[PDB]
Amino acid sequence: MQILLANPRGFCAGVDRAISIVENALAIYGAPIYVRHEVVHNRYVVDSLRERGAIFIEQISEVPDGAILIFSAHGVSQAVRNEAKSRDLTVFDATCPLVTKVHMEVARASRRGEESILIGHAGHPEVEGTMGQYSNPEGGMYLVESPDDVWKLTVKNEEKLSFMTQTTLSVDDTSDVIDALRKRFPKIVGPRKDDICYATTNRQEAVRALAEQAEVVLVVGSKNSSNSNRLAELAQRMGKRAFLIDDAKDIQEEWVKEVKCVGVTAGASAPDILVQNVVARLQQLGGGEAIPLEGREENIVFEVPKELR
Ligand SMILES: O=P(O)(O)OP(=O)(O)OCC/C=C/O
Numbered sequence: 001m002q003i004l005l006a007n008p009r010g011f012c013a014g015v016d017r018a019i020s021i022v023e024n025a026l027a028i029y030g031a032p033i034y035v036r037h038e039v040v041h042n043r044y045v046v047d048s049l050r051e052r053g054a055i056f057i058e059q060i061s062e063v064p065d066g067a068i069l070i071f072s073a074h075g076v077s078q079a080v081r082n083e084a085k086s087r088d089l090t091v092f093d094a095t096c097p098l099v100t101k102v103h104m105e106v107a108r109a110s111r112r113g114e115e116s117i118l119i120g121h122a123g124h125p126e127v128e129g130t131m132g133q134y135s136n137p138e139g140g141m142y143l144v145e146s147p148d149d150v151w152k153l154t155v156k157n158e159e160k161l162s163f164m165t166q167t168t169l170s171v172d173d174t175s176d177v178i179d180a181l182r183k184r185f186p187k188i189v190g191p192r193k194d195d196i197c198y199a200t201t202n203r204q205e206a207v208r209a210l211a212e213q214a215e216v217v218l219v220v221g222s223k224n225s226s227n228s229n230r231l232a233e234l235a236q237r238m239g240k241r242a243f244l245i246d247d248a249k250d251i252q253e254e255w256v257k258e259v260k261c262v263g264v265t266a267g268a269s270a271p272d273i274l275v276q277n278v279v280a281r282l283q284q285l286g287g288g289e290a291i292p293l294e295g296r297e298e299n300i301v302f303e304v305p306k307e308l309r
């Protein structure tokens with residue numbers, strides 16, 4: 001059994017910064033540090049930090065007066081940011097710079113009273129944060145998930161309209177939604193392509209190359225990691241069996257029985273120790289040395305705030 005490893009895979013620059021932010025806050029100020037929502041969608045990363053006395057909560061009401069609160073890498077609405085400001089809390093913001101960039105565009109559209117369409121998945125905290133940058137009742141902020149949603153959307157002024165995207169979407173699907181928006185709303189204004197970030201594009205491109213060679217693809221990532229799910233979905237649509245797994249214990253022998261080539265990748269929030277343990281388990285079920293595929297180089301790093309050292 002040949003084991004192939006996708007490249008790039010695993011931590012992106014926003015995740016690495018968000019994890020550092022919490023760790024350094026814990027090191028500067030001690031336990032407890034409160035965090036609103038899982039800092040990133042990875043059970044191991046979360047369990048890690050939690051067992052080291054970060055405390056994860058879903059609402060600012062659960063955080064005590066005088067405490068330190070960190071916002072997750074997915075970002076938060078204006079209302080959440082205001083609710084923390086109107087409380088007694090010291091706040092550090094771990095929102096990824098690439099999410100903040102999309103926030104700034106929505107806020108701009110809002111000030112101008114111009115209507116905005118976000119492409120994204122309803123209920124995801126990034127979508128809640130991003131939609132929550134829009135406050136002008138003169139305009140409007142609308143969410144679409146698919147070409148069908150576009151086909152049924154009506155807006156107040158289609159001459160003054162822009163669109164933005166969630167950063168972790170399927171490159172291919174989003175492209176279909178943009179083609180629909182442009183046909184429905186010829187004057188809509190957006191980015192040249194989308195707001196999908198470099199790490200999301202790169203992991204999709206890497207898993208496409210992997211799935212070309214591998215019969216089965218295992219994607220290391222938690223169930224609620226949107227970007228991890230896109231990697232698995234991509235492989236599946238190429239007709240490969242693909243499984244989203246949190247760790248090596250999830251691997252079922254039947255998945256890899258009589259398989260000549262198995263590929264492994266990891267979502268943007270999954271630590272490399274998890275991939276190492278998965279490779280050790282596949283070697284137990286008969287695979288040889290893991291071979292890394294050649295891939296696009298990534299060179300971007302986002303530093304913690306100078307306050308966090
Ligand atoms: O579920 P998502 O893909 O947004 O998040 P995850 O926490 O796994 O990865 C890092 C967050 C990406 C924000 O863009």
Ligand code: SF4
Pocket residue numbers: 012013014015073096097098099167168197198199200227268
């Ligand atoms: S997936 Fe992209 S936008 Fe999201 S944290 Fe990573 S680098 Fe930032």
